[PDB]
Amino acid sequence: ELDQLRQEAEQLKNQIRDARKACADATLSQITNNIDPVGRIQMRTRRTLRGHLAKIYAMHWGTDSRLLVSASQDGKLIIWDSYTTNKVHAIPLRSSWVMTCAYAPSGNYVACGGLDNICSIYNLKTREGNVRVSRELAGHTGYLSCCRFLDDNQIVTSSGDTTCALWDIETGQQTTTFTGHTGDVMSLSLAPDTRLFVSGACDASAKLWDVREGMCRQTFTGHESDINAICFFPNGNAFATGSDDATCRLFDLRADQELMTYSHDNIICGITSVSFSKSGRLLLAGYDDFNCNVWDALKADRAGVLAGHDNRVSCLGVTDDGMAVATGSWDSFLKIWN
Amino acid sequence: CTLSAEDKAAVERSKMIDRNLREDGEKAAREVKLLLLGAGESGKSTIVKQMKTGIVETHFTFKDLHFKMFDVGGQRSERKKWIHCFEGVTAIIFCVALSDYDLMNRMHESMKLFDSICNNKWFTDTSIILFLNKKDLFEEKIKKSPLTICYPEYAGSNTYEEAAAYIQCQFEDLNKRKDTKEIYTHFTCATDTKNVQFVFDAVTDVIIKNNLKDCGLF
């Protein structure tokens, strides 16, 4: 009955905790002792992208690192040129409510989703040049939180209902559905090889999904409130979460626990975006109180603040090569830092 | 200007697009946006069907003005994550059925929803238009089913005028922000031609009391 199986669950989840304590022998802050500190990090703005007329919810850099895409609470979905402040495309959406966007690796498609429970895939390079809807994906109970392109013919999505899914663009039907969450999923991030990904729910937990098989492999606890932003250590063996606990964490995939926590007394506001720098020595973080920070990944100490914004920093992302960091707050502007 | 000939036309394209952006952002500020919230079997459809998945959207025009309502009750997910998208809506329209007060008990659910939304941080500024509909059956349930079922404490005698005003004072006494916002209640039966005129009559009070606040006159 239910009583016996629930009793068994306590034993299995007590076998795990006594199997995650025989591995820990030294924290990350003892290994990294007598290691030279990073030092003051001073960064000034280089651009200001002022096209939008209302709040901005998502952004994603092109692979070449010279083009940007940006979604706001307006019909428009703008494609920016980061070297010179120019617009290359303006797209009018079919629904004013947008909570995500994405830019394909090959550079031939964009994507967008919002509260209408539909994912739209736009096409960019066509004869009779204009931007037209190439495909409409339907079949989500709740609102789309985030999306990502595995390659030109596939895409993973995460929805308000406790589920993640994998889509094939040529034929509308899904191919694999991941259903292990309780609580709303908020964000996901793909591995560098695209053979695994990590998603963060609202029940203060995270998973580790195999794409090909369709089954979870590791479950990571530790937070107290919902999490909202995940990233991958460039190596591909660790990730870092950000929550409304006003606390980031840095888990790892081979020991299956938490190496360190970046939290400070002054901050009580929540975190909305997390990203590593190239070479995994700096972790950027966009706090709720119109500000941002830089944390020394190997040492809990904090690099200098990076605040130029006048409202919430909804989303930010480091460029693929590593030259610059772009943050877009609720006020229409996006400032690029360098 | 150290710009090749091809480079100049990319600036002329960007200044062609800034024209489209303003010329279409100046046509999206004329419309007045409203939000429609209600509980299950409260009678949202009647006022939706009165005047002309996702978030449903509706357009209606009265006496040279354009309104857009957003019926969002089909989301069926946590409201904390997506309700902060809705600031800048001119007014929230809430609607309560009076036929169901006895029926476990819906009214308390209504009260706790109107209380959660009324005191939220995002909606500190915006005003609420409270409909209280389906009063044609509420006239008949008063005699057969007494008002005491919701609250034994209430002293007053059971009259249509004496009960519905007391309920109204039960709803209007839930907002902490007396100074910041007001509530514009209105009784409506199943059929009332005048319903849209009360919304057009109250949004102008909201717009004037915000225009005399933007310049510090108040």
Partner: single-chain antibody, 232 residues
């Protein structure tokens, strides 16, 4: 995505005929437009231009003040009106489309043109090989030279290549240095440096036997190079 043109015919000198070009199949309101003429046997030449929105109009030197170009966006038509035609204004008039943003391909599609018979400090491009014989399956290289450094400070060198098969309109092959126009076989490739250029065909079939042209697009007025005819 066809562009059809009309006008032409036989005109006595001094009488001004007009030319129309009726587009159908694309978004006409966001493309710049051109006109390119070809004399009876000579290489192409650049008559005029218009930007998007008719906000910027240029001209050539020999028609500056004699021709007037104008566009009609709602009716999808491009007009060129000629005035007091001279005996040396006899040429077929093609009509060329072009869009300018980051990463686009100008001169991607060309009209078929009309035939007009009037009765009776500039960058010099150079290619000086004509009627070069070729055999299918060989590797053929064709060279070009310019009179000024086409390499701009930003790293783009503005040099376009084209191909006119006998009896057809010309066709874009390489949009800039080290680039391949979409829709063309991968055989073609071109590598330059400074002001020396070349186009190389690794293994050619017998379908591409036609004249090749080369254009600088760096600054107006867009000169073209002489012809280079491949004979079989």
């Amino acid at each position: 995505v066809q562009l059809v043109e009309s006008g032409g015919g036989l005109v006595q000198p001094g009488g001004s005929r007009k030319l129309s070009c009726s587009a159908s199949g694309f978004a006409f309101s966001s493309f710049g437009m051109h006109w390119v003429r070809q004399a009876p046997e000579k290489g192409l030449e650049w008559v005029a231009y218009i930007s998007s929105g008719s906000g910027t109009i240029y001209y050539a030197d020999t028609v500056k003040g004699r021709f007037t170009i104008s566009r009609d966006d709602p009716k999808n038509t491009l007009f060129l009106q000629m005035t007091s035609l001279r005996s040396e204004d006899t040429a077929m008039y093609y009509c060329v489309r072009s869009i300018y943003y980051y990463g686009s391909s100008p001169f991607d599609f060309w009209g078929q043109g009309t035939t007009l018979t009037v009765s009776s400090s500039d960058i010099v491009m150079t290619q000086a090989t004509s009627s070069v014989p070729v055999t299918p399956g060989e590797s053929v290289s064709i060279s070009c030279r310019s009179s000024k450094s086409l390499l701009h400070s930003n790293g783009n060198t503005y040099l376009y290549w084209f191909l006119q098969r006998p009896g057809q309109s010309p066709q874009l092959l390489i949009y800039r240095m080290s680039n391949l126009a979409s829709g063309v076989p991968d055989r073609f490739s071109g590598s330059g440096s400074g002001t020396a250029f070349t186009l190389t065909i690794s293994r050619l079939e017998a379908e591409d036997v036609g004249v090749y042209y080369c254009m600088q697009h760096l600054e107006y007025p867009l000169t073209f190079g002489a012809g280079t005819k491949l004979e079989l």
